[PDB]
Amino acid sequence: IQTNGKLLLAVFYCLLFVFSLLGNSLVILVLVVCKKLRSITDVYLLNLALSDLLFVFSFPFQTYYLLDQWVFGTVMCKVVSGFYYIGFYSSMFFITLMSVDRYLAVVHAVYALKVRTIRMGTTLCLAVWLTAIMATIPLLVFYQVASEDGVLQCYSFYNQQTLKWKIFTNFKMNILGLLIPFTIFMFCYIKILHQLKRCQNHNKTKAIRLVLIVVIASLLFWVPFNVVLFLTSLHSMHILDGCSISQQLTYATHVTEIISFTHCCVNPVIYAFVGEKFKKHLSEIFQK
Amino acid sequence: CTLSAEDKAAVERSKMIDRNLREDGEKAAREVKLLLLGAGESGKNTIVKQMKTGIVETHFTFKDLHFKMFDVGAQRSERKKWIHCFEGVTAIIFCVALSDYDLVLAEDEEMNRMHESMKLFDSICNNKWFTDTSIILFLNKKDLFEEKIKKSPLTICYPEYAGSNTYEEAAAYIQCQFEDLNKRKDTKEIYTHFTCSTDTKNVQFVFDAVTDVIIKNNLKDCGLF
């Protein structure tokens, strides 16, 4: 039962790892090798693909941890905790940054002419990487490896006084993770849809469809995981305490993690693969 | 480094030149390029007058937007040799005179002036160098068309036309005829505006059209398409 579930989780992790590796590697190969990064959107796509690949890189360590004990040491445990958490924060910050870029491009075209430059995109990308690293140092250092019943596990292991810090991780993962980005993410796309409706062109319908697709995918990918994280936080503060409810949140956290990091595969497709530019670039590559 | 002193200074001069080129290229990319076309005395000079050799370039800024307008009415050469230089313009401002239906061309009476305007529109709209470039259609001489349509019917230019002699129906028919010439209706969109000499909102119509074109271009760039 437990072994079967572990095997299923490892299989899902490995499949998602391979698929997102292929997709993101294709994105980077098209952008930084085959073609140039002409526009700010190319810079954002490359940065988002790199963030997704960095998030993906943590998967096989998780697969082995499910399979066996954490054997490769504490220093990697630190760097992989960083990998995971900077991957998450960078991915969501870059999603929000793309949303703001699209809002500027559509709603204020004349202003987007003077503000949207490659240098500004690089500056904002460096800022996003820096703030992700800054948010991740506390969790980068608080992770440690402990051997329980002869099984070494790299996990968040603190003292009783530091248990409060674990609550702060989830809340930061909710405010800096979900609340702050999605507030800008949803507002920008809601106003994009308003302008697209009040327009006369052939490209309005497909743009509306793709904006709705992005919004629905992002909500479905992040709101469930963050809600379950909030529920686990509430359980930790003993507002709703119990063993059965704890087991339900364990299973729910597993499923929501699965759903949340299928984003590392879906986001490449939605943001790049569909659309005229990347299809044309792939056609040019195939011609070669 | 394996470079002499003057070799290093030359490389530094090259990098400074590259920086200047990058700044000038960014400035050019911020700017909007419009190609202005017309058949005969279609009112192209009048619309140039409202907004403000071989190519007469006119620059003007409207609502924090810098406008380049290129006029090629004086080339009088084979258009196919130099029409690919203008590939990449934001929009093509086509000027067509409405009063030309009654008048015949100066060269021979066989060809009506509006038919030559249609042929030019068909060649420009459907050219392979302008497959994705929108067209702003300016239909001028509204007062002249009002005066003429009472005396002379639109049937002279359009024998198939069976409609009222009123301004609205004839203008709508002419606009529809010009819009049917767009074979690639999906790639481009044609904006038609009825202007006269006393009209003062033509610059606003052009600005709105270019705003729509920029929105569509950056939608394509952003991947939304």
Next chain:
Amino acid sequence: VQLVESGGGLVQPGGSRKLSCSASGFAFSSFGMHWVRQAPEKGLEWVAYISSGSGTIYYADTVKGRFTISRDDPKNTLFLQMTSLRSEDTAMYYCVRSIYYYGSSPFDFWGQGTTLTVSSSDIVMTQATSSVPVTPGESVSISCRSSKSLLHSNGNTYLYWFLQRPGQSPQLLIYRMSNLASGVPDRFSGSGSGTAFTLTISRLEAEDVGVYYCMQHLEYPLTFGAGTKLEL
């Protein structure tokens, strides 16, 4: 083209002064700029150099730290700020322009000169004779030697020739050992084997009297020669 230089004056030892070179008649932003010092009875010595756009700045060891060179492109002026002056700096200072691209002519134009009076591995260039009697209408060869080979891998040998007529600022004669400067009469010519170089004047007029300096540009610590004087 003119390079009027202001500053100078009597200075007490250990004091500080500012030297201003005003440029009029050419694109100041494009040209790299130098400062060259000539002692009251001795030859030329390089001081500092600023490139186009102030990208790179190089000083000599003698004036390193004490001196700073800055340019102001909008006002078309070049500044040399001197601090901790000593009796080693009492001399006339020259403001020289240099442009660097393929085929360019560095050290093309020299300023008149302003006089600064202080109250009380580098390549070596040797011009052995330092004084030669001459007759008008004859031919004269002036020899210079270099401690290291001035031939780079690119095939360009960096040797420069300057003429300092009595009471006049140096004027470029030959750049890169073979190329006559703009406006210099065709009688002058240069040749060398990469370590030792010669300058040959086919005919001498009364305008050719002066002192000739051999300069190197291979490494940026530019060292001028002692000089050879031609007197009739």
Next chain:
Amino acid sequence: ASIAQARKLVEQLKMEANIDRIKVSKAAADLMAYCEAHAKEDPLLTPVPASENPFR
């Protein structure tokens, strides 16, 4: 009028008609001889050693 243009064209053709022409074989042989004479000097036809090429 156009008549004068016709006369000018006729005169130009008459000037063009009287020029002497050698057989095409002689011109072909001359081009062949030129190509063979300067065959060695062509670097694109025969690549030079990499040392002699400044484009390295």
Next chain:
Amino acid sequence: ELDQLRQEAEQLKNQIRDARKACADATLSQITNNIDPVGRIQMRTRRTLRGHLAKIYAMHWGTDSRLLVSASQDGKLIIWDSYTTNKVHAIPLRSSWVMTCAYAPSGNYVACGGLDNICSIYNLKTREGNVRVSRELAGHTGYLSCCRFLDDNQIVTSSGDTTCALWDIETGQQTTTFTGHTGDVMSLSLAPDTRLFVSGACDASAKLWDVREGMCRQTFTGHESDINAICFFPNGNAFATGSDDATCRLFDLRADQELMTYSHDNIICGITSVSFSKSGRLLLAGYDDFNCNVWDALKADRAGVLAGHDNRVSCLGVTDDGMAVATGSWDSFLKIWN
């Protein structure tokens, strides 16, 4: 009678074709059949010159075989150093619609022109240290398709007004105007001896001209569409034409007729630029299909293909020493091949 004049012109044309057919005893293919084939010629891109932000419409080589100038629609005319990818100069232009550029043999001047119908001469070597307009040549009523320098004071320009011109730069006046083309002249090539030049136009005709007199000695026909590029054989007794009918043709002046055609079934796009190697054995033509094919002059065989340009190759140029050939393309890049 006008009909009589037309009949006389037709009779003269029949005399011309009969004489040319008389001179065609044996074609080039039979004579050069026994020549050892050149073989495949693979040429790597030695240098890529980046810095242009728009389609490169023109490119010329200096006499020194190291400095080249490039014209683009970004409004700039950049002089490159080929050996070290350095920009010696970057010249702003009053009109960004340029289609041709020239490098003076002395190297002191660079000429640029385009849809403004003005040939602008730029003085590279000045006391002030900056490139300046020296003379603005006006008088044409159509776009300048090509201009080449005879010397510091004389320049030959071909325009879309169906007339070529030879200018005296110091006074800015037309020394002699060349007329006789029904279509727009698209390219010109001076003879190495510089007493004759060939002009190719949209009438599918190439015409020899004498610079001193102003008359057209020979008119060459055979193409089925506009001739875009023309180039003299190194001898000066022959020239090659590149047309929109996807064929290149080699003419000789003395025999007054075409020798053979450079065509392939796979090639459908028109030739945009044409050039010759130093020995004349190789004919390099820039095609509209993002490729530049190198041909063999004496045998119709295609030796090799220079690929590497994303967009249409718009200009070609072989150095005087013949060591390197430059391909400028609409993709805003220049490449040096050897």
